[PDB]
Amino acid sequence: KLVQLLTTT
Amino acid sequence: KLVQLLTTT
Amino acid sequence: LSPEQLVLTLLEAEPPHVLISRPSAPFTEASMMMSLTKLADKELVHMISWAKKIPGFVELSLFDQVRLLESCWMEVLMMGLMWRSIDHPGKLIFAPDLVLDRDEGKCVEGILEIFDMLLATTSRFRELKLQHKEYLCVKAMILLNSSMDSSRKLAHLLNAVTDALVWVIAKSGISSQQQSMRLANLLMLLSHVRHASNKGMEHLLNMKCKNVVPVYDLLLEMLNA
Amino acid sequence: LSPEQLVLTLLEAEPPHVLISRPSAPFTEASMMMSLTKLADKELVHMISWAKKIPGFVELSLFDQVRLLESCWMEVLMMGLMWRSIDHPGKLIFAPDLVLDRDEGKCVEGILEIFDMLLATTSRFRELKLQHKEYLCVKAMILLNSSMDSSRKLAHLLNAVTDALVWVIAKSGISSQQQSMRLANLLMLLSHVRHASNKGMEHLLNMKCKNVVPVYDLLLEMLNA
Numbered sequence A, B: 001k002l003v004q005l006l007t008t009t
Numbered sequence C, D: 001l002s003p004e005q006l007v008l009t010l011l012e013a014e015p016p017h018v019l020i021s022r023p024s025a026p027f028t029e030a031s032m033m034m035s036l037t038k039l040a041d042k043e044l045v046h047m048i049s050w051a052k053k054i055p056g057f058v059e060l061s062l063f064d065q066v067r068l069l070e071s072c073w074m075e076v077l078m079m080g081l082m083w084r085s086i087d088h089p090g091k092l093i094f095a096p097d098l099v100l101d102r103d104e105g106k107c108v109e110g111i112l113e114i115f116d117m118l119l120a121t122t123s124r125f126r127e128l129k130l131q132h133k134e135y136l137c138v139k140a141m142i143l144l145n146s147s148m149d150s151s152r153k154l155a156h157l158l159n160a161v162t163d164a165l166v167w168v169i170a171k172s173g174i175s176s177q178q179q180s181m182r183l184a185n186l187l188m189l190l191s192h193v194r195h196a197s198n199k200g201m202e203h204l205l206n207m208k209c210k211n212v213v214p215v216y217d218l219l220l221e222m223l224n225a
Ligand SMILES: N#Cc1cc(O)cc2cc(-c3ccc(O)cc3)oc12
Pocket: C036, C037, C039, C040, C043, C077, C078, C080, C081, C094, C111, C114, C115, C200, C203, C204, C205, C207
């Protein structure tokens, strides 16, 4: 979750 | 003990 | 990038104001914890976007980006709470529709302790007349200094934000000795933020284990890590 | 009391090094914790004496003195530990004949982690080339900043030690701007010390409940706070 928000906008 | 060292020593 | 422009980028990174969509009404131990956790979850999403808007953050290794956010999230949430509460003595402005009184923290065991800690530190920032731009620098520093190639990038960034805070203080035009005194006073308050932080999470963790608060994906993950 | 006299006073107030001997045979989980708790208790006694020598400390109410010490004792112990290990990378000098290698921390469940963050913070202090005079001021600041007409007197005491730290840094000769940056860099490390402290005390309580080592009297009172 934290990771997918760090790699998407 | 803490109070003793603080006030008695 | 000058300090003034670095601070402008922080201002531009500021997350939007968040509300929990809750019709005004009294608080119980369940309705409070549920509101606080629901708010924390929404703010966490915005916190991730905020971090990415800090010049250089996305240049760090994905491993560093994740470690910095997993360790400081609660402190960053509490720093924001204190800045929102600065103009409302005696109150904790978690959100427009989530304003809590000290005596309302008595509806939840172990939280009145933390509220007092947050209200005290808030009153301290109020006394210092914390400015918005200092708030911005301080919040960014919390994220960048929560660390316990990409390494030097981090140091460079932390140094840049520190230089921005010094600059902000220098603009207040106060005495040089008073500028140093102010710099030290603001930074020493961060220990009290990190303290209310560790306490706030211990409390939340105990709450999770009891399944008292609903399941929030991002928050649950941030908490577990 | 000028900054220089405050510093000289802290210099003289420095507690003597507590001598503790390393067990004959290689450390076991229990003998290491025995050595650490035995050292902490003796150092705690000297810490109290040291505190009463900090200008204005005895003028605070007895209850403020107690809250300050209960809240920062481990932080103080570790700051001293880090200073003693400053010129010994990969080594933690708990005491003259109690030099623990990062490795020996494997016999104790969950202490290696704490040893790592302690070593990390030490390297940072080393990298900044922390000076004895700065160190004295920071340790005193740690005690006075743990507020986790007496309350007002505390604020004045903290400002006095802070003025002393600023004075020490200026005597280094670096540019005014670099003095601000050094002040910021040093204080930003208090967060890391406070963090390690939290883990350290958490770990000690863990060990006590596990019955890995007996913890009583002074040490125990400080643990419960
Ligand atoms: N205090 C406190 C506290 C205790 C707890 O169990 C959970 C939470 C969550 C928050 C919280 C939520 C949103 C913020 O912007 C700041 C703090 O504060 C908490």
